[PDB]
Amino acid sequence: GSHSMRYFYTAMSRPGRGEPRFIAVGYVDDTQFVRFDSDAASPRTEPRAPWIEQEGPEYWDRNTQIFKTNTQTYRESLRNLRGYYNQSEAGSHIIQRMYGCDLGPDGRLLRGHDQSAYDGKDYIALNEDLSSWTAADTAAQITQRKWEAARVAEQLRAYLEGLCVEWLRRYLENGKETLQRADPPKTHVTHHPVSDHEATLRCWALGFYPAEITLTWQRDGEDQTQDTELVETRPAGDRTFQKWAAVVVPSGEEQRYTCHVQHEGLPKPLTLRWEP
């Protein structure tokens, strides 16, 4: 199937409480495989998936050097952006960055990404061409000029089309038993009377991987989008995910409702009903 690699960086200032914290996590699809936290007792890149453990000391040293350099770079960026928005030295602010590569089912580069945010708002993003930038405002335009002078987009394009795809393919091979295994959801429908006149039908999906799934309710073959309560997909803590969708139906009309499940682990989409 299709696979992606992403790094997620968070840099958080905390005036009067020390220097800004820098955290970086790395993912392959929905599997975290590395972490770095500048607040850790002795900051180092740590493994978070068993298939990354076979990487040698040169890998761990190289990652740690990069994240320690990022810790310093992001403290400078936080100072700079505070300046660009004429903000006071009193408030806490956050820079976030997410970047990485997407592969298609053939393992070829689909597209690259490199996006940054300030206080949870888009700030600057590398365009899909991997050559130009989209700056959100006049402050982000200042970062854009700096990045144009340092040839940043050219450096990112080289990385995204090169090392990013190369290392992602390596991880996919080393972790092929899990990363290239789709676990289909275990599905069932529960019934909960809410009154004499109505009952809740809840369609469950458990134990699936990756997190991407579609759970919908239909009444007489038509989608009940506005009347469906859909919870956010949530992690089980064992690599898999869970989700449910619920509809409040009139008593005696339960068999007019069907739950539809689509997942990569499913050859064909599933159709479920309440089984009394």
């Binding site: 890998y59 190289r62 990652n63 350099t69 990022n70 400078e76 820079i95 700096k146 990045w147």
Partner: peptide, 9 residues
Amino acid sequence: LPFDKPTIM
């Protein structure tokens, strides 16, 4: 593997 060049904003 992460990107290795600094990106001061």
